[PDB]
Amino acid sequence: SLIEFGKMILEETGKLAIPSYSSYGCYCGGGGKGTPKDATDRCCFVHDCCYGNLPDCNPKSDRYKYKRVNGAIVCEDGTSCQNRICECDKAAAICFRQNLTTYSEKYELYPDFLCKGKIKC
């Protein structure tokens, strides 16, 4: 769930999911159209695609558990949806941490009409 995702993001990056990653670019938050603007946005695209691979799961509300072993994120065992959701989210958090040096506030509240283009998962 967004509660766990939010916590991963904060832990990894030192940034609050809302609003740093909830209105960024074309895919972070309410994405769904266009070419991703930068590496962070691409992280959101991949994350959207990962969720899109689980059409009978409910990633926003189904809670999972995770722990850290030596700083690394480890998804605890739960149902099979919880497992897959967690791996999607873990990958996004690490993607965000990897691209922190190019995070650009100019993409915050990015306007919808500028999200142009096409990109398949």
Swiss-Prot record:
Which GO annotations describe the biological process of this protein?
Answer: arachidonate secretion; lipid catabolic process; negative regulation of T cell proliferation; phospholipid metabolic process
Cross-referenced Gene3D superfamilies: Phospholipase A2 domain (1.20.90.10)
Q: Which InterPro entries match?
A: PLipase_A2 (IPR001211), PLipase_A2_Asp_AS (IPR033112), PLipase_A2_dom (IPR016090), PLipase_A2_dom_sf (IPR036444), PLipase_A2_His_AS (IPR033113)
Q: Which residues form the active site?
A: H47, D89
**Residues bound to Ca(2+):** Y27, G29, G31, D48
Name any cofactors this protein relies on: Ca(2+)
Keywords of this protein's UniProt record, alphabetized? Blood coagulation cascade inhibiting toxin, Calcium, Disulfide bond, Hemostasis impairing toxin, Hydrolase, Lipid degradation, Lipid metabolism, Metal-binding, Myotoxin, Neurotoxin, Presynaptic neurotoxin, Secreted, Toxin
Which reaction equation describes what this protein catalyses? a 1,2-diacyl-sn-glycero-3-phosphocholine + H2O = a 1-acyl-sn-glycero-3-phosphocholine + a fatty acid + H(+)
Q: Which GO terms describe its cellular component?
A: extracellular region
Quaternary structure (record): Monomer.
Q: Additional comments on file?
A: D.russelli pulchella is synonymous with D.russelii.
Checking PANTHER family in the record gives: PHOSPHOLIPASE A2 FAMILY MEMBER, PHOSPHOLIPASE A2, MEMBRANE ASSOCIATED
**Protein name (record):** Basic phospholipase A2 VRV-PL-VIIIa
Species of the source: Daboia russelii
